[model samples]
Target: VQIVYKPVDLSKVTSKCGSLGNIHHKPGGGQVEVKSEKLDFKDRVQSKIGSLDNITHVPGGGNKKIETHKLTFR
Candidate 1:
């Protein structure tokens, strides 16, 4: 049996579901750092907050999705 271990630095982990806020009719965005282990997965994960749906993914290459929102603001 082969054992594969993947270790990630929490401090360097970050993602953005959608824009942070809007200013002057322009879109302003920010990054979100995920620290909880339960929210971390190897494939895909989705979460809904109010009317916003946040989706994230960890690619097959092991790199996580950052600052990418699958859904647009409605």
Candidate 2:
């Protein structure tokens, strides 16, 4: 997955991923959830995951953020 965030310490971002036990998969496709204390420029915690099927963003669980983005397989 590709993530774009405000200019923060790249190391901090990488560290956060590591702390969240983030993993990268190839060939085999599936869905995974990423929990972060912050996302983009939001102050509250956020979590999301994207798969070949869809993408989901949870602002705080009570709110359901969903969107469809065109995905091109290489």
TM-score of each: 0.18, 0.17
What TM-score does prediction 1 earn? 0.18
Q: What tens-digit string does per-residue lDDT give for candidate 2 at 1-74?
A: 68554534334211122243444443556766756675474577665455456344333223334445554656
lDDT of 1 by residue, 9-67 (tens): 45565454554444344345655554554544456767643352345443434445555
Considering every candidate listed, which one attains the maximal lDDT? 1
Which segments of candidate 1 are over 4 A away from where they belong?
A: 1-24, 39-46, 49-74
The window of 10 residues in a row where model 2 has the poorest summed lDDT is 9-18
Q: Pick the candidate with the highest TM-score.
A: 1
Find the 10 residues in a row with the least total lDDT in model 1: 52-61
